[PDB]
Design a protein around this ligand. Structure first.
Ligand SMILES: [Mn+2]
Ligand SMILES: [Mn+2]
Ligand SMILES: [Mn+2]
Ligand SMILES: [Mn+2]
Lengths: 116, 116, 116, 116
């Protein structure tokens, strides 16, 4: 995959399972267009969002639906979702892993960017 | 005083100084309306964004312009900006501090919510 | 005032209150000697650990007793404690703030190093 | 592996390669005994530290040599190393992944604990 998402739960020390993820790409008129979506697996990973053909240069937004995740666990969290906004493939195709570490009042996000 | 922002720089171990911060409030047509903005002080803090009267329950977005901060330091970053989206809720008298810790390819954000 | 500790609780979005903190200094036989200790205040802070006179260059260890904090909240944690080991260096007048953000299975720590 | 270490570099957005890792186990006389050591691979991962037979109940310390890592990159960091101290296998054998995210003045650590 050129774009992969990995989500961990810092309260349980486990992958964050069944987290909804929505990806958007900024259009020429400066609006967010839907690009791809999915849910994390039992390993907290989401693959197969896109192909290298479709994943062109652009500004992307990866929205990780954290409030929904915590609420299904009976926790009322602070954030609505985590939003990761970045320019992709500006110097040629790259492989991107977006990692997120979730707590109820806190999250972290890291990008690991590799040249295929 | 009901909403404060604090930004730290994980590379230099220092407050992140002169970072632009824009706050938005979600309108009833589900678009983001400008609400308040400022730049971080020498201590990495931004106070006086809003007042208790103006800061009603709703969904707010705090956007921290991290890319321009790193570009000014000669460092190539990943994110366009950091985005913290949350619901403000009345329960008792409460202060919101949004803290953000920045790295070029990573950031974390935490909400400290306390009483008067 | 040359060394301060600040601890936040990522689960509740609050200062971590009444966390024991022990500071050690590495002796010439490479063992840890007790240096200072305290408990975090209502604001999650611990001041007055040392003085400028006493805080000479050397290797210091700050140990934050996180397990007992989580056990007191009924939450099962991973770490025995958080450990921050660093060298204090003279260059100009400098203040060290060790900040720590706690989750049951995760923590982060940052050093904010500033001038007078 | 029952014990795995993964290290990421938050300045480069890449695995942290060639990071030395030393593992210790607390002995009955309350001293740290060497238990295993190794270096992260090109993927930032360290496997094969131990076997399920040798990885008994105990208090372990995983010391990640962060100062050495940054210095070889020409960066003078704050911390001497990251220290992760935890009780392992207290309720029966588990599989442990210790993840660390490194910046010069900051690091994060998370444990992912799975039941084989
Ligand atoms: Mn380009
Ligand atoms: Mn309400
Ligand atoms: Mn010196
Ligand atoms: Mn046991």
């Amino acid at each position: 995959c050129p774009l992969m998402v990995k989500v961990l739960d810092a309260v349980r020390g486990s992958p964050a399972i069944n987290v909804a993820v929505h990806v958007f790409r900024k259009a020429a008129d400066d609006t967010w267009e839907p690009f791809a979506s999915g849910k994390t697996s039992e390993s907290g990973e989401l693959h197969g969002l896109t192909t290298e053909e479709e994943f062109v240069e652009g500004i992307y937004k990866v929205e990780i639906d954290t409030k929904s995740y915590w609420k299904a666990l009976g926790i009322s969290p602070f954030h609505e979702h985590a939003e990761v906004v970045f320019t992709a493939n500006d110097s040629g195709p790259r492989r991107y892993t977006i990692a997120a570490l979730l707590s109820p009042y806190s999250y972290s996000t890291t990008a690991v960017v590799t040249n295929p």
